[PDB]
């Protein structure tokens, strides 16, 4: 499947793409404002994610640090990124269907649209000013708005027992971005697309 990743933000982002135990395609790349990066993701990929990283420094070996979404100091991510990270999540060719969503479960750094480029389903977007409006206790110094699990590490926020409810903090994310997951047991905002669809992830869509 083809994913075109587009940076419409006015600032540089370092895109990342991983399935948690391996890179997808090259795993990461710098995207200046306006740049587009096309990656190929193997059919049958389960549990893939794409995200943006901000304020990164890398040396010539591709080693360094980012203020949001750092994936163990690598340009080319093999593992998932450090919150806060707005996430584009997907599972492809699962019994004939692709499943896509955006998630704020690991916080929010950059606004995002995640849309098919082929026919037969809708896109999802979270493009509100979550950082600007972020509750004081969730604001990340490096930038971004953390989820409450990351900050407080409780059973209720992290849904450790598999029983948890919405909270004051999950409801903040949900109010600004209804079409994104706000906590682990949120009512799903997953979109079902035809198997073998293609997609575009746009950072800063508006």
Curated annotation (Swiss-Prot):
Q: Name one GO cellular component term.
A: cytoplasmic vesicle
Assign the protein's first listed, main location to one coarse class.
Answer: cytoplasm
User: Where is this protein localized, as stated in its record?
Assistant: Cytoplasmic vesicle
Supply the name of the protein. Answer: Thaumatin I
Q: Does the keyword Disulfide bond apply?
A: yes
What family is this? Belongs to the thaumatin family.
This protein's species is: Thaumatococcus daniellii (Katemfe)
List, alphabetically, the Pfam families matched.
Thaumatin (PF00314)
Q: What does this protein do?
A: Taste-modifying protein; intensely sweet-tasting. It is 100000 times sweeter than sucrose on a molar basis.
UniProt KW keywords: Cytoplasmic vesicle, Disulfide bond, Signal, Taste-modifying protein
Q: Which cysteines are joined by disulfide bonds?
A: 9-204, 56-66, 71-77, 121-193, 126-177, 134-145, 149-158, 159-164
